[PDB]
């Protein structure tokens, strides 16, 4: 299993970025996918979580307001926006495949985020 | 589409005995080879090869999910009788299914004792397949009303289980999916 | 659920054992832990789930376990490869992460 | 919608609720046995207070369920055990004071000392091995001058408050309410009256007293040679010159009766440590023995979580050899071993034991127990008996295949076991007759000691060294008095163990003489033993012990053929 992000943004503060995310190697629609945030020298933070099978999502309360996300199944491609950037907001990006929520039914799962892609820097 | 197996067998939580856990598959691809390719502790087939499911269309799969004792695994076999069997979770003769059950052990105890996994241990009459009740209401043994009060001759129906890591193997806390067959593989 | 990880720096020598703490203010389910390392200029990869599980692909080397608000990560001898940042999970509620170990 | 109803559902809510209040006090008893701190002591303390107000409440539940309007056996049996009210029958002062003597004499004994010495270690050190004749007789005397004198005030007014709560419960009196264990009326051909054991312990006596006879004869001249000016060849033997403290045992003795002591007898500590043995391969040896004859392994709990080995000068766990049984499946041991022949042999007895409780683990929780108080350490016991016979260890390769077992050996190895088996049998026997004519007021109180004394002169032949006055209560210095405990199923244990032997040496197709015997790789044998054990208390001793002996009764044959080759022998000592 393999998870490619996009390259490196600059943007100015008030911007959005959207950042993506191809999956490849596993049934598309039968896990989820997570987002984490790392800052500089910083260790990772939870942004939010989205289903591949019924759009269903669950966000930390740190972002709630400011990130979203969607799928795309026919190109077994996942997508995360971050909204009215901030000078706080620089950081790598982050995308994982989970075993923590199931996509169909919306239960916790015994897991972890078991793959990662290689992380998209945002300067901002 | 594949059937969502993982998200009743790898689930964080299962339902109590006494109030068992109807998960419906539907509308998807069933694969059952990941299934029987498990060092799991019993897995027991009624009617319905493990080689052979795969080859089968069903209406509907239902996965019946839920914790009781290693000692009580046998009695969800069909055919049989016992406290689960009788007042929780019975199984029709006429069954067509696998049960699958493992030792969660190390998911399902405590130490202080696991109280989240009630059994009822007494009714006026024993149950039919498939059928349950989460009733609570004071059961009489007596000639005489209580009221809902547990005093003498009345009784609170359902027990706690107090799973430990410690327990031996019968009374070690089980993880059984039912399957019964009425989805594509 | 707040994850509390420590000591920040175990910085022990290659052949040695290693042990890495993870604390919750609320009491979680082994059910809902994880652990991942982190090289330098890599992302992060699972290590052990469901408190004493081991990841697929991942070395016997790595052993855990856990319950409540106690959860533990060893390694039972540091290799040089070994020389990572270290992580706890939880998803009990939300999903957090501790602060991370460097080892 | 009737009694038998009615009962039935009870049951069924104690034993439930009973199981995990079991589980919880056994469970906290055991991480104190091990961790001997304050922590430890305060969380057992009040898992048992929460296990003893429960059967409190529930056997006044248990009141409304009267038994003769009950048909199924397994039933009343299970609730009869509910309707006891024990000392809950009496006055709130009487109840209290009760309790209070209780505790009083048990602080005594386990605090008592002479001067300054205590009894374990110390006195009893002194009379297991000391061949000095003033020596002996002082720890002897002490103990029972400043120690069990202080308990007899107190012994009087307990006998009478027993004596009040066994008239409640509706028995004559206490030692009658002991007896009770061995009543199994209301299955006919079978039944018991307690007041028949009476009866029967005097019978077997009788006929084993014989073979006491000429060992005790034997024991008497070979004693002479330590104590020529002591010992009266005609007479009784002094109790202090027995081994022991109180004269329960003769195994000490055994330097000055051994038969041929020109010759090493067999010990297989040397043989265990030149091939490294270990606390692991002592229970690993013993399981596969249990194995041969059809029994269950031992279940991957017990090897985890049980303490097999001295957790050193850190952990303060208490190591006294015993098996446990915390419920719900959990079986363990606390025994801390040493590559010795002495641990090898134990090892046998704690996993017999467990044998067993693996055995009647099945039945409902309050028949989960011996048929009979004497059944658990008779079964523990002959298991042990295979593992200490040559051919055994020879098979399992301790011993020189090419050794020889000569019959000088035999007869060494027979007087050794007579000393432990049969040498305690008049003892338990003359104890539990005067502590029962005791309860039955057979006996004034200023005579209670008058009649001790003579009862061990005419039943053991064994003799006080001093004269003692009416305020003394010697056996309140022995542990099993001043604690309340029974202690003929030290009498009945013995008999049976033999009963079960021979039928099962039987069964294996043993050629030769009993003792000889190793039921070891014997199916039959095993299914014979196995089929009483898993019974528990479902059953009537009177059956559960004649699926296997073929008696419905205890007997003494099987006793005396297994020391018939020493029998013989003796005849022609004295
Ligand atoms: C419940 O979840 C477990 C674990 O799932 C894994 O971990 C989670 C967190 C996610 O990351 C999942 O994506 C992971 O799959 C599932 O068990 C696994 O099932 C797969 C598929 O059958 C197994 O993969 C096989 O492994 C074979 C080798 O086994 C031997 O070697 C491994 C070490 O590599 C060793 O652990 C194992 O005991 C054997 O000694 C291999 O030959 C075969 O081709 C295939 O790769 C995987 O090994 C299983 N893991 C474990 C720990 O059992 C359950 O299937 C899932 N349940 C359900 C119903 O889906
Ligand atoms: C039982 O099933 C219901 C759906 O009918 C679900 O909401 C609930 O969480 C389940 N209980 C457990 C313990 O999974
Ligand atoms: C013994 O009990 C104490 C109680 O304070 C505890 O701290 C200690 O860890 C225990 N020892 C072991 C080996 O568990
Ligand atoms: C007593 O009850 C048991 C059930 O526990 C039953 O098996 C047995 O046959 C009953 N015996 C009688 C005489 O009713
Ligand atoms: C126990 O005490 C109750 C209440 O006095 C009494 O009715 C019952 O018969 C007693 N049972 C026994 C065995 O003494
Ligand atoms: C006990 O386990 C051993 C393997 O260690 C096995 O050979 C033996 O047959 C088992 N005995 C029983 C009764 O299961």
Redesign the pocket.
């Known amino acids: 299993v393999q998870l490619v992000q996009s390259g490196a943004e600059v943007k100015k503060p008030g911007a959005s970025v959207k950042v993506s995310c191809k999956a490849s190697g596993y049934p598309f629609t039968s896990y989820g996918i997570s987002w984490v945030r790392q800052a500089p020298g910083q260790g990772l933070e939870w942004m939010g979580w989205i289903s591949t099978y019924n759009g269903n999502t669950n966000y930390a309360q740190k972002f709630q307001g400011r990130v979203t996300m969607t799928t795309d199944t026919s190109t077994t491609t996942g997508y995360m926006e971050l909204r009215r950037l901030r000078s706080d907001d620089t950081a790598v990006y982050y995308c994982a495949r989970d075993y923590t929520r199931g996509a169909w039914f919306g ?1 916790s799962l015994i897991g972890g985020f078991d793959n990662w892609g290689q992380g998209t820097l945002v300067t901002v | 589409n594949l059937c969502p197996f993982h998200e009743v067998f790898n ?1 964080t ?3 109590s005995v006494y109030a068992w ?1 109807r998960t419906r598959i539907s509308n998807c691809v069933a694969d059952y080879s990941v299934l029987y390719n498990f060092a799991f502790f019993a897995f027991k087939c009624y009617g319905v090869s493990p080689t052979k499911l795969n080859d089968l269309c069903f209406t509907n799969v239902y996965a019946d999910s839920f914790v009781i004792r290693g000692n009580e695994v046998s009695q969800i076999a069909p055919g049989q009788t016992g406290n689960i069997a009788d007042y929780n979770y019975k199984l029709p003769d006429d069954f067509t299914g696998c049960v699958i059950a493992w030792n969660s052990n190390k998911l399902d105890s405590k130490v202080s004792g696991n109280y989240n996994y009630l059994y009822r241990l007494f009714r006026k009459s024993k149950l039919k397949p498939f059928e349950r009740d989460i009733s609570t209401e004071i059961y009489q043994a007596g000639n005489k009303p209580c009221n809902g009060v547990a005093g003498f001759n009345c009784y609170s129906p359902l027990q706690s289980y107090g799973f430990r890591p410690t327990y031996g193997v019968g009374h070690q806390p089980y993880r059984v999916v039912v399957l019964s067959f009425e989805v594509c593989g | 659920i707040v994850l509390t990880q420590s000591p920040g720096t175990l910085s022990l020598s290659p052949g040695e054992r290693a042990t890495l703490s993870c604390r919750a203010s609320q009491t979680v389910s082994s059910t809902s832990l994880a652990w991942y390392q982190q090289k330098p200029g890599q992302a992060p990869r699972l290590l052990i789930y469901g408190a004493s599980s081991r990841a697929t692909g991942i070395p016997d080397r790595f052993s855990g376990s856990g319950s409540g608000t106690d959860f533990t990560l060893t390694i039972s001898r540091l290799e040089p490869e070994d020389f990572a940042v270290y992580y706890c999970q939880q998803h009990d509620t939300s999903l957090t992460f501790g602060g991370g170990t460097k080892v | 919608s009737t009694i038998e109803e009615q009962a039935k559902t009870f049951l069924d809510k104690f034993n439930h609720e009973a199981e995990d209040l079991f589980y919880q006090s056994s469970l906290a008893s055991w991480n104190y046995n091990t961790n001997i701190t304050e922590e430890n002591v305060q969380n057992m303390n009040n898992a048992g207070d929460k296990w003893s107000a429960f059967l409190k409440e529930q056997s006044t539940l248990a009141q409304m369920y009267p038994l003769q309007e009950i048909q199924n056996l397994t039933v009343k049996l299970q609730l009869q055990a509910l309707q006891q009210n024990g000392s809950s029958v009496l006055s709130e002062d009487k109840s209290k004071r009760l309790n209070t003597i209780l505790n009083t004499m048990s602080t005594i004994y386990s605090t008592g000392k002479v001067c300054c010495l205590l009894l374990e270690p110390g006195l009893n050190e002194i009379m297991a091995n000391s061949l000095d004749y003033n020596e002996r007789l002082w720890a002897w005397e002490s103990w029972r001058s400043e120690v069990g004198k202080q308990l007899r005030p107190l012994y009087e007014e307990y006998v009478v408050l027993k004596n009040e709560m066994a008239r409640a419960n509706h028995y004559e009196d206490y030692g009658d309410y002991w007896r009770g264990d061995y009543e199994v009326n209301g299955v006919d051909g079978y039944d018991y009256s307690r007041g028949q054991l009476i009866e029967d312990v005097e019978h077997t006596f009788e006929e084993i007293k014989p073979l006491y006879e000429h060992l005790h004869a034997y024991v008497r001249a070979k004693l002479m040679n330590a104590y020529p000016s002591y010992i009266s060849p005609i007479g009784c033997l002094p109790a202090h010159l027995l081994g022991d403290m109180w004269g329960r045992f003769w195994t000490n003795l055994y330097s000055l009766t051994v038969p041929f002591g020109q010759k090493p007898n067999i010990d297989v500590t040397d043989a265990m440590v030149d091939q490294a043995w270990d606390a692991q391969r002592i229970f690993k040896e013993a399981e596969k023995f249990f194995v041969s004859v059809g029994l269950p392994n031992m279940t991957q709990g017990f090897w985890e979580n049980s303490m097999l080995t001295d957790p050193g000068n850190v952990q303060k766990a208490v190591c006294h050899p015993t098996a446990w049984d915390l419920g719900k499946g959990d079986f363990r041991i606390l025994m801390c071993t040493k590559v010795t022949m002495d641990d090898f042999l134990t090892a046998h007895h704690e996993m017999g034991h467990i044998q067993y409780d693996m055995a009647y683990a099945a039945q409902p929780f309050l028949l989960r127990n011996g048929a009979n108080e004497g059944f658990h350490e008779a079964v523990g016991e002959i298991m042990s008996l295979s593992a200490a016979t040559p051919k055994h260890l020879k098979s399992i390769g301790l011993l020189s295949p090419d050794f020889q077992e000569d019959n000088e050996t035999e007869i060494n190895f027979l007087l050794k076991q007579a000393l432990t088996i049969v040498g305690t049998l008049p003892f338990t026997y003359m104890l539990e007759k005067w502590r029962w004519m005791v309860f039955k007021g057979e006996i004034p109180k200023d005579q209670w000691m008058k009649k001790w004394w003579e009862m061990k002169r005419e039943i053991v032949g064994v003799v006080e060294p001093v004269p003692h006055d009416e305020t003394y209560c010697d056996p309140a210095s022995l542990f099993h008095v001043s604690n309340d405990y029974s202690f003929i199923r030290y009498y009945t244990r013995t008999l049976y163990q033999f009963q079960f032997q021979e039928a099962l040496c039987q069964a294996a197709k043993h050629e030769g003489p009993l003792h000889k015997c190793d039921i070891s790789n014997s199916t039959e044998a095993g299914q014979k033993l196995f089929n009483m054990l898993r019974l528990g208390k479902s059953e009537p001793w009177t059956l559960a012990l004649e699926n296997v002996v073929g008696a419905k009764n205890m007997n003494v044959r099987p006793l005396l053929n297994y020391f018939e080759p020493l029998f013989t022998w003796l005849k022609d000592q004295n």
């Open positions: 239960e | 689930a939580t299962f339902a856990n």
